Structures are given as C-alpha cells and as structure tokens.
Amino acid sequence: MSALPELRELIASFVSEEPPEIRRIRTGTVPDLPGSYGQYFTAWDFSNSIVRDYAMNLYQLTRLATDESVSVENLLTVFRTLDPIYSTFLGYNGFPVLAEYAQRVGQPAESRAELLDRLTTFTEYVNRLTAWSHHYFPWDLGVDSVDSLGDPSQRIPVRLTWQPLGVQVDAEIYADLNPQLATDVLKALPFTVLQDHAVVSGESMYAWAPLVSVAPTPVRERICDAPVGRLRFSQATGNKVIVQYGPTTETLSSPVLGKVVDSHADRLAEVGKAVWESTFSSKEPVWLTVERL
Amino acid sequence: MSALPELRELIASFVSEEPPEIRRIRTGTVPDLPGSYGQYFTAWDFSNSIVRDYAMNLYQLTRLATDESVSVENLLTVFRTLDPIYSTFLGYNGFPVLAEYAQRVGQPAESRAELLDRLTTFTEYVNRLTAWSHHYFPWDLVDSLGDPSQRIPVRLTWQPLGVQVDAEIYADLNPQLATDVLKALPFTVLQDHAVVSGESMYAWAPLVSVAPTPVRERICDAPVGRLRFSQATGNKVIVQYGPTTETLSSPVLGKVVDSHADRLAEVGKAVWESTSKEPVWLTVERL
C-alpha cells in the first residue's frame, strides 16, 4: 500500500510548488525565531545544511532496510539514535512536520514493510525539501571510455528541456551499464523538476529527480574525469540527475547514467551559465524536463 | 591500549592549536580548489557544515557501540554504509586525514571495546575540527532537585578577559555525566558563542561522555547561568547567560552561583563577536 499517504501528496505538491518551510526560513518568519542576536542567516545556514545531511542519513538508512544481514529491530534501534537529534533540531529550525513524521518512521510497526517504504517515502520527502533549500540559499554572499563500452542497443534516447530557456539537448541512457539504476530512472520518466547548479563541483548542474533508486551501481565514473555532457545519477546526494558541461574538480565516483549527443553538447554551456545564475544570485526558477524519445 | 594513539596525539595538539585543515579552508588553500566559479565560500560552507553534521553521526555511532542488541557485525554494516558519502567528500573538501582514519575505523574490530575506542577517539578528533571551523566561520554575512551538598564547585576563567565566575556542578542529578565531566578538569579550551539559540556560549571539552542523562532541561526554559553538557552536539559545556530560543532538551551539568551571574553578560558580549573570529580561552578547574 502507501507507507505515509499524506507524504506522497506532499512529494507530488513539492516537485512543482515551493514548500512553505523554505519560504518562512528564507524570509525570516520561522515561528520560534531561530538565530542569535536579531539575525536569522545562521539559522538559515543550519536549516540548509542539516536538512541536506539528514537526507544523506535517511538515504543510507533506506539502503540498510534492504540489507538482510542487519536485523530489522537492530536497524530500528540505529534509526532511533541518529535521526532524533537531527529531527527535533529541524523541527525547531523551520521543519515542524519533518520532525513529526520522523517519529512515525521510528516505530516497530511490522517489519521491512514499515522500514523500506517508510524511509523511501520520508527520504524522498526530505530530499525534496533539500532541493528547494539548495535553490533558495544565498551562495552569493561569499583513460579508457565507458561511453564506448556497452551494447549500442541498450541506449535509450531521451531529450533534456530547460524552460524558460527553450533549449533541448538529446541524450542517451546507458541501460546495460547500471540496469536497475537505469530502469529506476526510466520508470520515473518523464519529470519536470527545478534545475540547480553544483556549488562546489564546478561547471555542473543537478536536479532532484522524483524517485529513491536503491539499485546497485556496478559502473561509476570519477566526476573530474567526466566528459562534457556526462549524465550522472547521484543516489547518495539526493537522487539527482547531474549534467556536467565543463571542467569539475570533485574526485569522487558517481554512477554513470549516459551522455548528451556531441551535436548538442555545445548548448550545455549557455544553460549552465543561466542555471548558475539561477542558484547563485537571481533565484529565477529554471525547470528541467527529462523525457523518453 | 588505545585504538589509534597517533590520533590521540592530534586531539591533544588541537586543544590549543588550530588544525592545519581549518587554516587552509578559511584561506582558500585547498589543493584542488573546490567551489564553483572562482569563489570558495561554498566549499567553506560545505566543510563547516559537513564536518559538523558528520560529528553528530559519529557520536550516535559511539552511543550505538554501547547498545549490546546491535552486533559488531551490524554496527560495522551501518558504519560502512553511512560513513563513505561523508568521509570521501570531506577528504576532497579539505579533510584528507579525516577520510584516511574513517576507513580505519570501519575495519573488522575484533571486539566491541576495539570498535568503541576507534569511535571515541575519532569522534573527539572530528569534534575539535568542528570546534575550530565553528570559531573561524564568517557568520557575520531543576536546581531544587537533589541535595546542594551533593554538588561540586568549579571555577571558570575567560582569557584574555580575566573574568572569573564560581560555578556548581550538580553531581547527583546526572551522576555519570558529572563524573565524566570532572575527570577532564582542568582543561583550557577555546570559548565560542551559540549562533542559533540566543545568548549562550559553548566550548568543546576534551572528552566523549556517553553517560546516561536522566535529567535534561529544555534550553528555552533554562535560567541565566545554566551549565549544560550537550553530548550529542560535540561534548561541549554550555553557559546560557541570557534569553535563548532553542526548544531542545540538553542534559543539566550545573549552574554558576547567583553571586557571579552578573559577570556572565560581559563575557557573552565579548564572546558573541569573538565567534571577529578572535580566540577566547576557558579554564574550568576543581576548587
């Protein structure tokens, strides 16, 4: 069935509409008034950061609900230690409903039924809150080929569309490299989600996709070593579809999803300039649509 | 024997000196130059936040090694699942040694004592990295319960302010917590101010108490002069000298006597601006 049905309508509402929480935090109208000495930028820094790291904790707890070596009640114990501290502080720092649903996950309700699904739903919920926080946070104040490796018949064509940019690139999903990962993304297609730029990785863009893929990733590519047009699906940082359009420095391995065709790789730099303008200063909503051709 | 004595040497040195990582991140001397565009404040904002939120993960894992229902094979599984995304990103974002010692904690610790000490040593290591990052981060952009005779006096002195209050630790309310805190006396650690609660000051103490805390007080309900030892947010001693808004309940460690509570407002005024990022030291000692 549905773990927390009231959450699924909230995940559906927040893929397109801004959550009231991100608004009250960014406008300094959080009810309890967090922040020291007349100012709320520091509490803003703690809401942006804690809601982000909480989401990383929740995702790995979702991956743990799949591990059968870890006992079910043992996992419920682990969840009822790290989650509480993050929840009640987020409940005080502008995320009250996030705090309330966290206790509902920390319940001995059944086993696995209320472990995997509950986290999945809640993890997708907190990743959507983190998506809007990353968008509306004032960052302005401060080898061999994997593309060749693989059956050419397992390439699934997709088109990326940025509005109101009006730009469309054509990409290719690598479905034989990470089978279940590609299946998890194609079953979520099509989706239109807010587009944001990477803030530490360099010339890269990521958008939180509406899914919680727990699929294995046998093929992973180092980010800094990714070609122009690289499609990556980072499950650990919030199930994001990442499009790299230039040089990046992050040396970590992220799952490989595919790549934009070379004829359309020239149009990614302009979109990245506009999307960086969307995350760094303007805060103007640039939407991304991934769809199957 | 300690699990990682070379880490214990780093924890001892960082009480008075700034870690070499915290220096380069605050100055933008990270080797691969992280951060988008030409600015590095985002890499700074991520290093301060990720290492602060990582220490909380490490502390609850340290508390999980006391749970005997969770097996050492199971705690190592939750470690080898939740740790990498935080350790490898920190290793790239200016904490390479933190990444190195993180895998060494996830080894097949033959015993729960072996794994727990790896956690306790590493938790204090990351807690001091969070302490110096919190100090140099540009943010400018129940008393009647128990018996009085069951309470131990201490003396707090802030340099170079020269301000000295006399406090009283309630050793009967949270016995294990108070015992674990007194064992660190005397200690001189950097004093910082709270940035989200209100008029409060905390300083990271050189210990990792996982002692039970039966008596916890809501911060918004805490009187002026309240001594709190929050184990979850990095084992720091907190002195509230004015109004606070945080509604979370932190363990009660003691309180500065009413006679010297008039002297706390001045220190907090010269500590809020110190967190200017100018260092201020705190010495707590047994009288």
CB contact under 8 A, A142 and B45: yes
- Claim to verify: residue A93 and residue A212 sit in the same structural domain: no
User: Counting every residue, how long is chain B?
Assistant: 287
Shared domain check, B79 and B205: no
A127 and A164 together in one domain: no
Confirm whether B140 is domain-assigned.
no
Residue B65 domain-assigned? yes
- Counted domains in chain A: 2
Mark whether A174 and A67 lie in a shared domain. no
A34 contacts in B (CB within 8 Å)?
Answer: 196, 245-246
Based on the domain organization, do B201 and B87 belong to the same domain? no
CATH of the domain at B228: 2.40.100.20
Q: How many angstroms away from the CA of B251 is the closest CA of chain A? A: 13
A142 in any annotated domain: no
A100, with CB counted inside 10 A (0-12, 13-18, 19+), is: exposed
Q: Hey, are the CB atoms on A82 and B73 less than 8 Å from each other? A: no
Based on the domain organization, do A220 and A100 belong to the same domain? no
> Do A38 and A160 have their domain in common?
no
User: Of the candidates B37, B69, B86, which has its C-beta nearest A77's C-beta?
Assistant: B69
Domain encompassing residue A194: 152-292
Q: Which of B102, B135, B168 is the last residue in one of the domains? A: B135
Say if A194 falls within a structural domain.
yes
Residue A218 lies in a domain: yes
Q: Which of A36, A49, A95 to mutate to test the interface with B (most CBs of B within 10 A)?
A: A36
Determine the 3-state secondary structure of B161 from DSSP.
coil
Q: How far is B264 from chain A (nearest CA, A)?
A: 16
Put simply, the answer to whether A60 touches B37 (Cβ < 8 Å) is no
**Interchain CB distance below 8 Å, A56 and B93:** no
Experimental method reported for this structure: X-ray
Residues B219 and B250: beta-carbon distance below 8 Å: yes
Residue A143 belongs to some domain of the structure: no
Are B128 and B162 in a shared domain? Answer: no
- Contact criterion met (CB < 8 Å) for B89 and A141: no
Check whether residue A156 and residue A284 sit in a common domain.
Answer: yes
Choose one of A137, A171, A195: the last residue of a domain.
A137
Contact criterion met (CB below 8 Å) for A279 and A190: no
Considering the domain architecture, whether residues B24 and B79 belong to the same structural domain is answered as: yes
A182 plus A228 within the same structural domain: yes
A275 domain residue, yes or no: yes
Two structure tokens written together for B17: 């000196």
CA angle B241, B242, B244 (to 5 degrees): 115
